[PDB]
Amino acid sequence: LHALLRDIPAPDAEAMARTQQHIDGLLKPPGSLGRLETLAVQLAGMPGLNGTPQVGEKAVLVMCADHGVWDEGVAVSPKIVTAIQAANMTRGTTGVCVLAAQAGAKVHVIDVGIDAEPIPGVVNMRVARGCGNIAVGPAMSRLQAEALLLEVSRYTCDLAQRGVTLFGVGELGMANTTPAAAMVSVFTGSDAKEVVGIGANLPPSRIDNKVDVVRRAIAINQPNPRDGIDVLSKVGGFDLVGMTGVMLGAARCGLPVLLDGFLSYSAALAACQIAPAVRPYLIPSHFSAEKGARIALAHLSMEPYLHMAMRLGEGSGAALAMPIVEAACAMFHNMGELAASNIVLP
Amino acid sequence: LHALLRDIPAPDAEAMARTQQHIDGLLKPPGSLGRLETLAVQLAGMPGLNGTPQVGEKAVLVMCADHGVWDEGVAVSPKIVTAIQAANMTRGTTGVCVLAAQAGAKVHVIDVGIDAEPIPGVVNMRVARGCGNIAVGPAMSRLQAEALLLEVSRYTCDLAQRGVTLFGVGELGMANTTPAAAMVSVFTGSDAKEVVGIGANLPPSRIDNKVDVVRRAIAINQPNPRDGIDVLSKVGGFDLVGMTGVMLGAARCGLPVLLDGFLSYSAALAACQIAPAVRPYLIPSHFSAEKGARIALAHLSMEPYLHMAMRLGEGSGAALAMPIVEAACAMFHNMGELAASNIVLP
Ligand SMILES: Cc1ccc2c(c1)ncn2[C@H]1O[C@H](COP(=O)(O)O)[C@@H](O)[C@H]1O
Ligand SMILES: Cc1ccc2c(c1)ncn2[C@H]1O[C@H](COP(=O)(O)O)[C@@H](O)[C@H]1O
Ligand SMILES: O=C(O)c1cccnc1
Ligand SMILES: O=C(O)c1cccnc1
């Protein structure tokens, strides 16, 4: 793991410079394609991309797990929904599934800790049958967190070996917006009230309770904000850890990762805390409708491309943004050049 | 024309109600897909869509024309660029071309008034060799504006006959951000300084001049804000008129139109002024980096989905948003249902 972290490559400034120059020469006023140009340059700097903005195969990794904190009354979805939805993931009837197929991405469902019998067709990496209830103690042990980071990290990079060049992250886990808010609070130093949202339709009345649980989780565990692994283990969840692991793996592999929503922002904060070298590989997708979204994004210094008021999770926003990434590549490779038309601008 | 306007269909509330109910029953927390759900409902209300969110063939209509106001020093691109770029449109090397191909849309290049010899391969609807210089008089005659609206309107609806279900609008015309700012100022009652931008890289120093030209155009022509046709004819351009005409045609045809950037917002304001019934058919794409974008969008009461800091025009933003529209359809038609999984939420 320390190895893993040590070996994350820096971005290739040389490739980026060449990309910039090429973009500037395209059939358009310079800088006119805005963020699409910036994105293209970003991709070019990623070592696993072979010095150019390109997209081969696409995959969305969905990390599923249950949380003990569900017992605190923080979620209206029945616990079993995690197991059910996970199975549905295998049938392609879920939101991410439909969106991924639309983008031509393949969905990978990974069980990192669902509290139910194993689901056939789902990749098994189960840590335990749900994590500990963060309201009264830690979600898991440091060892447990580290091992999972390791395992997921490797799975991720292994996919790269098989042609995958673009990843998307997602999750599934009733009550998961609770540990997510906890992490956000800790990493950003914001008060719980500021970052706790309605998650999956939590009734406005039930909010106060959710805010109390978060505070309690923090007070009780005393997570160290300067130690991402500490935070994940104490007030996180298996799903959140899995997401952070995809991020670490893609970065080590020198490949891009599309973030999703609120849950993903949490994981991103952790990953960047653990390894700042991870940052350059991350790509925002959409602006989650979760209350704590703005605070979380500010801390990540990210401005998502999509404003859809989405709040489903599963990696749905990530799938939705994939065509944007492909568009930046298309721009890069298929547009004509000013010079060739004898067009001269100032 | 009055006929045309008279016959624009109202949206089908019945279809919309059925769509809403269907969406609510999908495998997800209700309302969780946010704007994607709203979009799907919007599409269902469009009569040419056959009571369901669906996308068949896609087309982007690009209206090209030159402007006399170019002579006022408001644009850094050489005048000939319009003619050149238009030809390039026929070769698929332009920004819209590349993006449209990515979305599987076909680009239609229409010459409504380029000041050059006719370009083979380009649809000919030329009004004149460039419009009048709005700084000293009107761009064209009312008759001229009306006829063009008519002609474009018809072309648009005719495409519908051939399978097109989704349109995108775009333009090409050096100096066009000038008449656009003029229209915006007039329709919204905002001062010129507030809505005049750098267009295609106009140097910050040269701005004042551009602001003066706009004021002059207005003072001199005295366009009537309550009369969209009056405004278009006086301080608009052939390209802007063409765009408004696509909007009127698609609406009459009961089909959706994706807006583009700043130029398109101008045209949208005019169309909505001319016929409010047009509104429900319009769909924002991206948030243009042009200074007057915010004011224009507010008046249209629209919140674009994409924040890409784009400012190229040509219908590039429109092409970029097409996959979003298709995504809403996919959601609608391919997701599974809560009931079927025995999932019960509150
Ligand atoms: C039927 C259903 C319900 C929720 C779902 C879902 C499908 N897909 C994602 N989520 C989202 O809701 C949960 C987080 O919200 P809270 O913390 O309020 O539970 C996670 O499962 C998240 O993926
Ligand atoms: C090479 C080139 C230049 C401009 C272009 C373009 C390609 N494609 C679109 N535009 C954009 O720039 C023009 C409006 O900006 P202004 O009012 O400053 O001229 C229009 O042609 C608009 O389509
Ligand atoms: O932003 C998300 O991804 C999200 C928000 C609420 C509930 N589930 C997921
Ligand atoms: O927003 C646009 O479409 C735009 C802005 C500047 C120059 N051309 C087009």
- Kindly list the structural domains of chain A, giving each domain's residue range(s) and its CATH number in brackets, ordered by start: 1-54+327-346 (1.10.1610.10), 55-326 (3.40.50.10210)
Please give the distance, rounded to the nearest whole angstrom, from the Cα atom of residue A312 to the centre of ligand 3. Answer: 5
- Token readout for A62 is 């969905």
What residues contact residue A38 under an 8 Å CB cut-off, 6+ apart?
Answer: none
Any chain A CB within 8 A of the CB of B123?
A: no
Helix (H, G, I), strand (E, B) or coil at A119: coil
Q: Helix axis angle, A142-161 relative to A238-252, nearest 10°?
A: 40
CA A78 to the chain's CA centroid: 24
Q: Rounded to whole angstroms, how far apart are CA atoms A344 and A346? A: 7
Q: Rounded to whole angstroms, how far apart are CA atoms A180 and B193? A: 45
Ligand 2 closest atom vs CA B201 = 18
Would residue A237 be called left, alpha or beta, if left means φ above 0 and alpha means ψ between -120 and 50 degrees? beta
Name the minimum distance, in Å, from the CA of B225 to any CA of chain A. 31
For residues B247 and B278, the answer to whether their CB atoms sit within 8 Å is yes
Q: Rounded to whole angstroms, how far apart are CA atoms B290 and A115? A: 52
Q: Which residues of B fall within a CB distance of 8 Å from A35?
A: 307-310
**With 0-12 CB in 10 A as exposed, 13-18 as middle and 19+ as buried, what is A2?**
exposed
Helix (H, G, I), strand (E, B) or coil at A57: strand
- Token readout for B219 is 């003072």
Helix (H, G, I), strand (E, B) or coil at A220: helix
Q: Which residues of A fall within a CB distance of 8 Å from B323?
A: 102-103, 323
Q: Rounded to whole angstroms, how far apart are CA atoms A342 and B21? A: 56
For residues B190 and B295, the answer to whether their CB atoms sit within 8 Å is yes
β partners of residue B108 = B61
For residues A314 and A45, the answer to whether their CB atoms sit within 8 Å is no
Cβ–ligand 3 contact at A199 (below 6 Å): yes
Q: Rounded to whole angstroms, how far apart are CA atoms B86 and B169? A: 15
**Which residue in chain B is spatially nearest to A35 when comparing CA positions?**
B308
Q: Rounded to whole angstroms, how far apart are CA atoms A321 and B291? A: 26
Q: Which of A293, A289, A290 is nearest to A268 (CA)?
A: A293
For residues A268 and A282, the answer to whether their CB atoms sit within 8 Å is yes
Do the Cβ atoms of B81 and A343 come within 8 Å?
yes
Do the Cβ atoms of A35 and B346 come within 8 Å?
no
Q: Of all residues in chain A, what percent are helix, strand and coil, respectively (each to 5)? A: 50, 10, 35
- Token readout for B242 is 């063409």
Q: Which residues of A fall within a CB distance of 8 Å from B331?
A: 95, 98-99
Do the Cβ atoms of B34 and A78 come within 8 Å?
no
Would residue A280 be called left, alpha or beta, if left means φ above 0 and alpha means ψ between -120 and 50 degrees? alpha
Please give the distance, rounded to the nearest whole angstrom, from the Cα atom of residue A123 to the centre of ligand 4. Answer: 47
Active site residues of A: 314
- Token readout for A24 is 């500037």
Q: Rounded to whole angstroms, how far apart are CA atoms B148 and B155? A: 11
CA dihedral (A155, A157, A162, A163) positive or negative: positive
Q: What is chain A's Cα-based Rg?
A: 20
What residues contact residue A260 under an 8 Å CB cut-off, 6+ apart?
Answer: A168, A169, A170, A171, A285, A286, A313, A314, A315, A316, A317, A318
> What are φ and ψ of residue B124, in 5° steps?
-90, 115
Q: Rounded to whole angstroms, how far apart are CA atoms A177 and A179? A: 6
The total of other beta-carbon atoms located within 10 Å of residue B224's CB is: 12
Interface mutation target, options A93, A286, A325, chain B, most CBs of B under 10 Å: A93
Please give the distance, rounded to the nearest whole angstrom, from the Cα atom of residue A290 to the centre of ligand 3. Answer: 7
Q: Rounded to whole angstroms, how far apart are CA atoms B174 and B186? A: 21
Residue owning the nearest CA to atom 2 of ligand 2: A28
DSSP class of residue A205 equals: G
CB-side neighbour CA atoms (13 Å) of B265: 34
| Secondary structure (H, E, C), chain B | CHHHHHCCCCCCHHHHHHHHHHHHCECCCCCCCCHHHHHHHHHHCCHHHCCCCCCCEEEEEEEEECEHHHHHCCCCCCCCHHHHHHHHHCCCCCHHHHHHHHHCCEEEEEEEECCCCCCCCCEECCCCCCECCCCCCCCCCHHHHHHHHHHHHHHHHHHHHCCEEEEEEEEECCCCHHHHHHHHHHHHCCCHHHHCCCCCCCCHHHHHHHHHHHHHHHHHHCCCCCCHHHHHHHHCCHHHHHHHHHHHHHHHCCCCEECCCHHHHHHHHHHHHHCHHHHHHEECCECCCCCCHHHHHHHHCCCCCECCCCCCCCCHHHHHHHHHHHHHHHHHHHCCEHHHHCCCCC
Please give the distance, rounded to the nearest whole angstrom, from the Cα atom of residue A179 to the centre of ligand 1. Answer: 13
> What are φ and ψ of residue A303, in 5° steps?
-120, 100
Ligand 4 closest atom vs CA B317 = 3
For residues A165 and A47, the answer to whether their CB atoms sit within 8 Å is no
Helix (H, G, I), strand (E, B) or coil at A59: strand
- Token readout for A317 is 């926003």
Q: Rounded to whole angstroms, how far apart are CA atoms B206 and B223? A: 25
Q: Which of B116, B98, B119 is nearest to B107 (CA)?
A: B98
Do the Cβ atoms of B88 and A28 come within 8 Å?
no
User: Which member of B29, B327, B344 has the closest CB to residue A99?
Assistant: B327
Any chain B CB within 8 A of the CB of A198?
A: no
Nearest listed ligand to the Cα of residue B180: 2
Residue corresponding to tokens 């207005």? B218
Q: Rounded to whole angstroms, how far apart are CA atoms B121 and B64? A: 13
User: Which member of A95, A200, A304 has the closest CB to residue B331?
Assistant: A95
Any chain A CB within 8 A of the CB of B28?
A: yes
Any chain B CB within 8 A of the CB of A226?
A: no
The total of other beta-carbon atoms located within 10 Å of residue A323's CB is: 22
Q: Is B175 annotated as a binding residue?
A: yes
Please give the distance, rounded to the nearest whole angstrom, from the Cα atom of residue B33 to the centre of ligand 3. Answer: 10
Q: Which residues of A fall within a CB distance of 8 Å from B91?
A: 336
Ligand 1 closest atom vs CA A199 = 18
Q: Provide the strand spans (E) within A10-56.
A: none
Do the Cβ atoms of A99 and B330 come within 8 Å?
yes
> What are φ and ψ of residue A56, in 5° steps?
-105, -110
**With 0-12 CB in 10 A as exposed, 13-18 as middle and 19+ as buried, what is B111?**
buried
DSSP class of residue A190 equals: -
CA dihedral (B101, B105, B108, B114) positive or negative: negative
> What are φ and ψ of residue B53, in 5° steps?
-75, 115
**Which run of H or of E encompasses A45?**
none
Q: Which of B265, B248, B300 is nearest to B2 (CA)?
A: B248
DSSP class of residue A11 equals: P
Distance spanning both ends of chain B, measured CA to CA: 51
What residues contact residue A282 under an 8 Å CB cut-off, 6+ apart?
Answer: A247, A256, A257, A259, A268, A272, A300, A302
Q: Is A135 annotated as a binding residue?
A: no
Residues 70-89, chain B, touching A (beta carbon < 8 A): 76-78, 81, 84-85, 88
Name every protein residue with a CB atom under 6 angstroms from any ligand 4 atom.
B 177, 199-200, 260-263, 288, 290, 311-313
Interface mutation target, options B58, B79, B98, B198, chain A, most CBs of A under 10 Å: B98
Q: Rounded to whole angstroms, how far apart are CA atoms B305 and B291? A: 18
β partners of residue A60 = A107, A168
Do the Cβ atoms of B335 and A93 come within 8 Å?
yes
For residues A67 and A178, the answer to whether their CB atoms sit within 8 Å is yes
**With 0-12 CB in 10 A as exposed, 13-18 as middle and 19+ as buried, what is A219?**
exposed
Do the Cβ atoms of A334 and B93 come within 8 Å?
yes
Q: Which of B187, B200, B183 is nearest to B237 (CA)?
A: B183
CA dihedral (A93, A95, A100, A103) positive or negative: positive
- A239-262 burial string, b = 16+ CB within 10 Å, else e? bbbbbbbbbbbbbbbbbbbbbbbb
One-letter amino acid for residue A211 of the chain = V
DSSP class of residue A131 equals: B
